[PDB]
Amino acid sequence: MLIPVVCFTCGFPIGTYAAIFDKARTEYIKTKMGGTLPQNIPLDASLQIELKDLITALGIPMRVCCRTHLITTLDYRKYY
Partner 1 sequence: DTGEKVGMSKQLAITANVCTAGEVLSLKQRLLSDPAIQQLADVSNKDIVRKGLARVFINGEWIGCCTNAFELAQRYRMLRREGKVVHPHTTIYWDSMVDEVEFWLDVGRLTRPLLIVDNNIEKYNQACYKAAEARKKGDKDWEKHKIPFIQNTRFTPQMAKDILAGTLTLEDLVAQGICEFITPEEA
Name which position in 23, 31, 35, 40 contacts partner 1 (CB under 8 A).
Answer: 40
Positions of E strands within 7-79: none
**Among positive and negative, which fits the CA dihedral 62, 57, 17, 42?**
negative
Q: Answer with the entry of Zn ion, partner 1, none that 39 interacts with (C-beta below 5 to 8 A by kind).
A: partner 1
32 membership: H or E segment, kind and range: helix 18-33
Q: Answer with the entry of partner 1, Zn ion, none that 40 interacts with (C-beta below 5 to 8 A by kind).
A: partner 1
Question: Quick check: 31 binds partner 1 (CB under 8 A)?
Answer: no
Using CA atoms, how far apart are residues 30 and 1, in angstroms rounded to an integer? 24
Using CA atoms, how far apart are residues 11 and 24, in angstroms rounded to an integer? 23
Q: Answer with the entry of partner 1, Zn ion, none that 62 interacts with (C-beta below 5 to 8 A by kind).
A: none
Q: Which of residues 43-62 bind partner 1 (CB under 8 A)?
A: none
Q: Which of residues 1-30 bind partner 1 (CB under 8 A)?
A: none
